[PDB]
Amino acid sequence: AGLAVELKQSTAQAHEKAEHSTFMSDLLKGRLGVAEFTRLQEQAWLFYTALEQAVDAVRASGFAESLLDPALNRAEVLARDLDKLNGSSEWRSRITASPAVIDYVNRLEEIRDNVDGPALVAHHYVRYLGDLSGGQVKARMMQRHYGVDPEALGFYHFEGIAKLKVYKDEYREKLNNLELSDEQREHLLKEATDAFVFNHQVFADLGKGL
Numbered sequence: 001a002g003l004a005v006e007l008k009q010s011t012a013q014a015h016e017k018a019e020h021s022t023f024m025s026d027l028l029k030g031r032l033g034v035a036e037f038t039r040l041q042e043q044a045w046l047f048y049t050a051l052e053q054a055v056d057a058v059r060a061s062g063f064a065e066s067l068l069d070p071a072l073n074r075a076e077v078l079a080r081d082l083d084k085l086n087g088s089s090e091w092r093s094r095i096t097a098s099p100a101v102i103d104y105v106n107r108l109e110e111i112r113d114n115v116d117g118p119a120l121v122a123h124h125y126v127r128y129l130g131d132l133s134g135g136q137v138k139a140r141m142m143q144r145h146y147g148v149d150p151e152a153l154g155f156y157h158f159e160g161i162a163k164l165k166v167y168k169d170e171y172r173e174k175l176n177n178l179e180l181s182d183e184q185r186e187h188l189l190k191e192a193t194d195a196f197v198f199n200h201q202v203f204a205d206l207g208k209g210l
């Protein structure tokens, strides 16, 4: 075999490289602070805004409307998280994207303009499925290590989903039931590996200095 299982087996090597990065290892260990966590959330808002722009364009065309659920949207809740984290709403006009986040947004803007359905589905898998399966863990250690207020952690909470585990199995079945050509499947497969590299490069840029 299936598409959901194939994505979890081929991108398993790249997924191990993301959790073994200097920045993510220090952030989850508790060796950093709420300033380093806030810089990660600031960069995440920049690529999630670009990601959702591409998702909105591909959903409008009819490509995988059931898969692209607008309840998964994180840019609106990430903006509210950064308002509580920074203490003000004035962060919007003073944040600069890192070299990796620029490359990431450029890729998501190309996917939006070309309305590349399969490539968008690969980026949707990489970001949203990881958020649903590891959100509650990252929110727990952010409160334990940095004392982040639970209301400033809405990114890790999906209010539109009552059964979180059931939603993961429904997302994988919708991914498996995507009618795709052999070229569209290989494009989605090669894009899924690319999307993991983009997210790993974001952590590599953040880890510089500390």
Ligand code: COH
Pocket: 004, 008, 015, 018, 019, 024, 125, 126, 127, 129, 130, 133, 134, 196, 199
């Ligand atoms: C323990 C460290 C860790 C971290 C920090 C982390 C953060 C990130 C991250 C950050 C940018 C990305 C791109 C991913 C990528 C993913 N992670 Co993780 N993951 C991690 C370990 C896991 C584990 C374990 C799962 C459970 C898989 C499952 O069966 O739900 C997971 C779920 C996923 C899934 C869903 C796959 C599936 O179930 O089919 C993707 C994609 N991810 N992860």
Ligand SMILES: [Co+2]
Pocket: 099, 100, 201
């Ligand atoms: Co670079």
